[model samples]
Target chain A: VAPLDLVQPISDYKIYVSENLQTLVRDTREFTNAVKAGDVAKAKKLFASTRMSYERIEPIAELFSDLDASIDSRADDHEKAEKDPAFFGFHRIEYGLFAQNSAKGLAPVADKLMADVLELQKRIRGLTFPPEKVVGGAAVLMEEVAATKISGEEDRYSHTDLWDFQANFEGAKKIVDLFRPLVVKDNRAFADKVDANFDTVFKTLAKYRTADGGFELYGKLSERDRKVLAGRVNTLAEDLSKMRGLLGLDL
Target chain B: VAPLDLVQPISDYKIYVSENLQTLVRDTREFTNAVKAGDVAKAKKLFASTRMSYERIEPIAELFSDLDASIDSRADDHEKAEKDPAFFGFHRIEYGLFAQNSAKGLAPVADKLMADVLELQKRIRGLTFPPEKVVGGAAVLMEEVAATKISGEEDRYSHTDLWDFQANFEGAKKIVDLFRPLVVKDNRAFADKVDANFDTVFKTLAKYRTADGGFELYGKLSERDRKVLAGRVNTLAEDLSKMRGLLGLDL
Candidate 1:
């Protein structure tokens, strides 16, 4: 087989990443503003959706380790848990909004979170996307969803794990779509298999959609429901893991 | 001025690190055995002293990030706080023994912690020390103590921050003692200044020691007591930061 041209796919993927980052920055600003204003109800409403933007582009966003840790790391990552002074960012605010049921004294935390998000945006603009990492990100996203998020541990306070699940699914699917043509040309059967796997995963997720166009709180799901979802996502992850090799992008 | 020969000092420091790792492994095994046996009181008694060995060699132990996180990382570092399945190690056991007041289901956690500590010991034996990181570890240790541990946040469950404070102090001081000859030969005045700063910090720590050779629970310390310790440690940190240059080991 001849060497496939990744230049166009890489360029398109960069645009996809940049677009998601813009959404993340804009939504995070509004979410932080609501928290800073002590608008508990407003912050609660915006919380999951704003984090959805971040969840979608996590593979790209995680490149800047410091910003990622500051913006998304949970209380468990710190030496002192919730009381650790360094524990700030989305989940810290989430704890205030959902667990504590108030946003009082979260303004300073909101301000720092906004600063970290802006820094992430700045760094993303300066980054050069490595093709394999960008393509292989599909697998990384799905694998994480299967391994961690599927357990509903991610949104323990708010029970918003479904929102994260959807975002991660979309993020992984976006990568597959971007490189679809190349993948199809290389091996049409494999592409069809991957596409079918994604459809199955999507259908499983669609069952959880609420009347408000949001996902059901993760706590509402049965053990069987979670197990089925984990199995489907794991299958998709396995298929996506082959993308780089199919496109000759493997190191 | 002729360059100082650091061969002897570097070898001595490696031996120091090796000895600490041995102590840490032995102590951690005993600590884990108590936890696994469901002897809450025994686990509590062994907890702070066992961690003291690990704390003293943290700068070196931290080189293996995975082992370090497994053996020492706090719940705040995880996504789900205390409930996160990945949350294990000394602090987790501390929570069971001190906060929860039981070791009912922590046997598996103890087993994992013991495995991780053994892995760390194995890795340390085969490792070569980077002279700069080894020497510069003094400043790293003091800086972390001044910055984080002094807050009484580290051992929130057990209120055992003083044990950590003393261990970090000894670790940093060990580095200075090992490199003293080189630093003194190069800059006698600077070495004396660093030595005096160490004495002051030690005196502050000594006041907290109890008749049983244990430390007062961190919660008993007044805010002013913490402030004084933080100030002394910060001063010591600043002096230690200059050690690498004095020893011609600065990058």
Candidate 2:
């Protein structure tokens, strides 16, 4: 029989997550520095890399809703960005660095972004993580990707939608991994279905991976391919969303 | 302190709700009978009366979403009524009885609504209601009022928005009445705020009550009164939504 390792409690796991978020803020600051220097390529390069830390703990990041919205708000979240001044965030900077092909107008946005991330990092320390919230957030992120990001609207400027999707899946999968053993013991069939769904989704995502370990530009996808991706993404999201209830973590 | 009412446990409460629902199905069947019998004026008279039991437990009723949508669904719920003949419901019968002024085409809708209600009554017996859900469901009904019913769109054909709104308020309020002692004990200030908001909303509604006890048609109200009605409904809904948490019933 395998010996059960004495594990940290869920409360301690959130503290570990907060540390990761703190590190993410530093990475975000570096990415903003590149934008401030008007180096579009450098800013673009740092963008995906910086998201590594942020995406790993984004469900918790969303707990600070205002700051999260300020840092990561999408253009579509606003009624009319053309007439609204509050439409500023990562995607705003992304538009400047990619579509506009210049970082000239993004300095202020970068500053605001950094401020939000720092606030998020600080707030993360005081929060607690029940299994329901952690699992629910992960499932919700997948739903968001299927509902919005897969349509290529998420990162329209840079076709970076796939990166966000990959990261969201990874974040959810990590939580699922943490609870897998206990879930398997409770309901082996449900756990097996979740793992099967994860395999299917990751395998689908892998088809778009570039030689350099990044994703292919979403703008290059054909209509047929886009439809396939959407269907698979939605299927996987629906499957993952069941994990919270199966784990008896739902309210 | 006043003595506790020796209230029944939560399980019994659901059965009570189900009995109320069964009684409501009978009410609806009679209303539909008026429609099927070419009794337009009679159907119109019974319309508001029939919804009495429905408004009392709408949240639980809504748990059977497909059936609810099938029975009481609005024209707005459909994408294209022209293409989808399946878009029959209570509102559809209301349209024929009021707008079309005939029972010529509504027999199908009436039959379908009764079948759905009967199914709902059967299903309700197996349904459960935790205290948090009962409270939360009540709050959500007001949100529905603020969002749609207040706009006078919920009963466009009959112009009976006030009837629907009043019933929705009563449904939500009954649940609140059940939890009031507990909520008052948990947070007196919050309880006071809830009571104050409910008073404002009910008073706002009472303004249009006629001598016969029926409400005035929505179109008869001045634009200013409509705005006031919406604002007060929303304020109460916002306050009521906090009760579940205040009562220590939220997860």
Candidate 3:
């Protein structure tokens, strides 16, 4: 039997992508303005929040490989580590703002990063969403959280990994929510299982929320805290990985 | 128009995967034996060579993600870095052998590594090759080399990155060679361009080959030398990334 039609879901996701891209552009512009202005405190404050929208739309944003590499790549991904010429992005700015404790010499890097984010917004506007990838996005986001974000290495300097963690969780949750009716139609039990997993992850993250609505720095978490989060995310990732198959969108 | 038939090419690749898996099992057995015996020097000698066949078949081997993580993942992938209980694999052993210069406590780790390798061999025997992944394997290999291997981080302990580098190059080259006739049938000019890119990468790698058919320690290379190789591999990766589309197997 054929899976439920995804035409409406995909059309809805395109709208989601467009809205997020505009927010991403706006947030990035504000973040980069602080960097170029040498306002270290403001740039540091805006860093993780600015990444929220980008993280939410990563499955689509990362399709433009060049822009993804330019705007979001970590220093570990480069040959020269922090010194590589190709290593200019949010993390590069993060290093200067949080590690070096200054925003000096980051103006040019900020400019290039803003330019790449703009290019990403432009490219995403014209892209025809690939259904399998769109369905697979939830799995990718969860896997990333389990595999890398759990390590706290991503925001080592800033200790703001929980910000990324929340953003990734929310992104995956959004996809599942969009496709919920179809998932329930195919297998109500399976949809319940996915929702339970997401609920477990959400409640765990809620523990880290601060009074100001941001998360506590990642370093505040104990080893067991990390393990608990990783275990939950891994379970979610395993379930979501089967989504494409369940949707009959496997490639 | 249809791309040339890939039936024979894929059949040939399965045989290649099978042969390499057997070699991987054999080499890994010997390597673990040395580790179990607490023969540090012998284990160090066997380390990089044991990884050769595994590296050559990584595109297939890594499809078994669980075994891949247990047998090949780096410390950076785990939460606790070197101290993570889950950080057992070729790299964990490399840390003890090269960085710590001891094999005293590695016997149990060695045993588990051997078990994972055996499991990997069993799994591969029952597997079917996915055509797009097989054709797309070359690009993945080159991208990994350009992205991470060029940093000398993989073999930071042993400095034997060149062995892995050569193995990845050979693996990708093997796939391209297997698909050459079909690629030429579809587009002779495209085939020539790919071949030339492969030649450029091969020639650059040849500069580091030692008299005994081994490669120089990664640390021996100058920064400029690393950049030159990264540049060549990146170009090859770009061209190879288009292979799936060229062969009309794009997902």
Candidate 4:
């Protein structure tokens, strides 16, 4: 989602996005359900509307065109990017996030959230065995986007980077969960990997934010908050680590 | 890098990584400057003693290995592990952070400091054009790491995972700074394009972290922090943004 040119007050941006997100979420039900039901045209239509809010997407789209060049100076050595989890993770986040964060109030959270989401995406994109699942993944994506609009309601300007992060993470996370039931019954893998990524971002939010998770657009969390949150994060990350181990998936 | 033995206490792992990083910082003068003088061999020789603490490097190396596998997962588009920047950044901290609480026990301030460093690294990485200077760059890295190590010398073994996050972030950050100038000076076109990519990153960081030029790591910040830090970060990002734009890269 690229930022839009409707630059008014940052808060204004948030309000606009958030209000429309309600519509986006409702549409997501149709879009994703259609995809799940194997309706490609339906999914495409939804995707266009879902992304219509951000006019800046064109520039954002342009960046992804040179994705490798845009993110890593190293640009992947042959199959290195493909095979290397760390760098690949880097690419996913880069690929997913370009000009997002139009909501000035939530930009910090958005960026950190984007960073984590992209990295997690690397792992998600690699899950190829479920070819059939991939076919209907559009519905899953629609749900993810819709979820973002729903969850990020509390945030200013309706920018849903954090919610978007969670939604996407869950979408891919569900795939991991499907592979191994017992491990993720408690959402261990989801907790660990998704939350860990989320936590890292939280840490970033805390640094530049005021005690209220607000820093212009930066999110805030105090050191004490970090410590407390870290515990929650640890519990989650440990589970993800374990689930991956159980499922024989790499982390 | 990568996740090491999960069997180990996350805190202990952080501590262990911190111990080595402490040494890494202390030896920055020889480790970095020597390398810059076309003395990689000399730098390697100087780092020979680092083997005395190979156990320290072991975990990080393990992390790298995991990341490699993770990357491969991306390439194959298989059911692989999740990857993330905040993930990378946190591990960089969790695995690399060494400074511990003083007589006062866990220092909220110190944790905040780490939070600041982590946020700065995140934002700085978003920055392209690498602030000027190469030799001094190495010196600053060595200086910062060394200072951090010495100050937190007592708690080196306390937070292994966090410490690793710090070390790895430093490594990547240093490389960025070291390479940015070379890229800018060597190939202006490439630099501008890369800067454009990075510009988005910093803008995101700045917009979100406008709190104080400090990126929050965990929780939210106070309104006061946002006001002061936001001002600084805004300036930093603005100047840096201009520099990148002027490079005449293909935006």
Candidate 5:
């Protein structure tokens, strides 16, 4: 639709985000089931894609700060992460599934993560989408990828940070694409700047795609190559940050 | 208008700005006619009020950069302004009307000023209003008044800079008021800050109003009083500058 009449676009986006959350719940449950059943291989195989669904709606999902932390907290986010009881989230699962090569102690953590995801799903429908929130969320997702994900810190055990990075970038791009009609109508010059930056970032991302259609592990990249990726993600994010203001939602 | 559907508010504001231009052209015509008839007192009396209309929309008027200079250039705005042939605008007429206390040679300059105003009226309607433009324009207008108009340089010959200052502030306030609904909904804390700042500044402005309802001369104010006035204007302008970003229009 031209100009993205506020109500419909937001309502439609909420639906999109909600559906993604539903998928997240299903995958996380199955993944948790495998871990609970002591099927390490199945859990390992389900790990990346389960997290991908979460990444798709992560911008909005992260708004519920407590629940987000409970479900996705990184190792570094908690002091003495290996022993921190509070660090029971996706990374904790990764540590179990990949670092320890076992799922012996992950069932409860997965259950806790699933409960938090359910809480988020219930609360997501009640959110009132401020224009800035969508665009700002998108920008913030890219910023997170730039600052941490590209460093191979996220998913460090599984070396799947690139997959997470791509998922986050794609999620942000979806928000940007949704607002394109309104943004172009408001200011073509600024819209063109954002459009071009997104193009550059996407092409940069495609370079990491493996022949098997999977992404290279973050640790496999050279320092210069990692810097190049981080730089592109940051640039796109900086451009995305302008979206909140350009759309008159920065207030 | 609970949410100020984007296009409606922006397009309406463009129309509002354009309509103000038409009024400016009409008032300038009458003021020039009195100068042409050698009615010095009448010309001087109409001068401040006529310019008030122009000042109300001065920021956008300033978008036509060369035209803005031609119609509002002050003595200090140019080197050797007294001898600059290009320094013909409302200030040109102000010098003739107040400093020399004569209408001699003002008719032609007044005619030029009115024609330029007419030109603006026609061009303004074709312009698009980006959300940032209103908030940005309002902030810029206040900055100009605080930086130059409050110094008694804007209407040096006439010393009616306070009137222009008042008009500009009111214009900015109008824009702020226009966007109050959207602003409050977008960020209540930010909206409150802007609203409160405008209130404080308006109270400060009220102190300068004369018993006859006209503003006192800029030169008549004590240095301390001038500083107080400038201080408030500058503070409000600084606060107003946040509106663009808060409105998500900074880009």
Candidate 6:
């Protein structure tokens, strides 16, 4: 049996909402910056490298990745959406949880993050993409999350599917907005974190990849699928990094 | 100008937000009794039998028959859900409105009646019917009393919808619920008044009717579609009258 790592040597596991956690904010800001740069390569490495900000919930940081992938326009794949359609609502739920974790001290940062994330998603959805097999990575980001679920409904799912789609689309456009700033600034910290985050997302998805090369969500997929997903994991690593140059990397 | 009604203008209207008025309660109670008795048939008949009750909005009342027929449940098509998909919510809206207007006596009965007349159509979406056939009638119903809507909007279209169709298999249900007690208890006064209030609905719909008896919501349809709707209207009339039987009427 796993030994209980008791908090305060006898205290039980507690759940409180966070209001303002400065370190978390820094991480979020940096993370958002990396994504904005479209430094897929840097994003990939950063995704893998970052340690869990909250040591207690290290196991759950990956869960956040899935949620993030849904809103991340770069993950524009049917598999992501087929996995959870209420991704936007997921953010709200997570935000509430984050707010409740009082120890994090995230009042202003948390609120600003909420507004920024919402605006980012809205911007992605509102973006205009050119024709010719335009990849809508964020299209299916929020998959199957809007099913007739009433229980555990700490978040609002009303029109959430449509909301996620629109937001992610807008987020994609915002990504375009972020490209030049990301490359020219050459912020390695930001770039590395993005790389690590992307890596973590791909590896986690690959663990349960299906025969069709699609990764099943949150550890439900088969070994074959996991292998297939692993293959894309390798390529996504490359494509994301290529984003830096398109942004006039050295400029 | 009909001599401008040849009299001093009556008093102002009423709103039942917080509670129900005395007369409105009595009316709702009677209406509730009618519904409980399952006399939606008589409810329809009583609704149409009265002319003086509505006074000016007579033509609207005629729309009831057509509305019901438009989505009438086939005799053998007894899916228990055919009763009222929106049973509870529909009641709450009615009860809320009653609490605000009828019980308070704050609103004149004519104005209240105008409100009452508007309700049946509002609940049209609550009826359990095919989606394609019912959305128009439901929207039209909203248009009828666009002036006197009560809150609790999540059940059907909020404000109005010039386009789109939601799952309104709750059509029959909404109708049965909205006009219930009066239909079941033979609340002749309420039933007749409510029925009379419906005339304006039909006439209002008439303005939108195609050359054939069918009405056009957003587009033109083939002749067959028109006839189907026209025939459906008659069936609805009979069904509504049957509902009113709860009011202890020969209807």
Q: lDDT of each model, Cα atoms only?
A: 0.73, 0.66, 0.75, 0.31, 0.70, 0.28
Lowest lDDT sum, 10 consecutive residues, model 1 chain B, at B242-251
- Candidate structures ordered by lDDT, highest first: 3, 1, 5, 2, 4, 6
lDDT, candidate 3, residue A95? 93
Writing each residue's lDDT as its tens digit, candidate 6 over B154-194 gives 11211111111111212322443343443435455645544
User: How big is the positional error of residue A88 in model 2, measured in Å on the Cα after superposition?
Assistant: 37
Residue lDDT tens for model 3, A1-251: 15337877888888988898899889999999998898999999898989988888865433454566677777755435687787788999999999999888999999998888888887777666756556555554564555345557577689888888888888777778878888898688988999999999999989999998878988788766775675677566556655555665531
Task: Tell me the lDDT of model 6 at B1.
Answer: 12
Candidate 1 or 6, higher TM-score? Answer: 1
Model 3: DockQ vs. true structure: 0.02
Show where candidate 2 strays beyond 4 Å.
A1-251, B1-16, B82-84
**TM-score of model 6's chain A:** 0.23
lDDT of 4 by residue, A176-217 (tens): 333333344555555456545544544543454446643422
For candidate 3, list the clashing residue pairs, or say none.
none
Backbone steric clashes in candidate 1, count:
10
Worst 10 residues of 6 chain B by lDDT: B9-18
- For candidate 6, what is the DockQ-based docking class? incorrect
For candidate 2, the iRMS in Å is 20.1
The candidate scoring highest on TM-score is: 3
**Error in Å for residue B250 of model 5:** 31
> Of 4 and 5, which scores higher on lDDT?
5
10 residues in a row with least lDDT, candidate 4 chain B = B69-78
Q: What is the C-alpha RMSD of each candidate to the true structure, in Å?
A: 24.7, 23.1, 22.4, 21.9, 24.4, 26.1
TM-score of chain A of each: 0.95, 0.88, 0.95, 0.28, 0.93, 0.23
**Candidate 3 error regions (>4 Å):** A1-4, B1-251
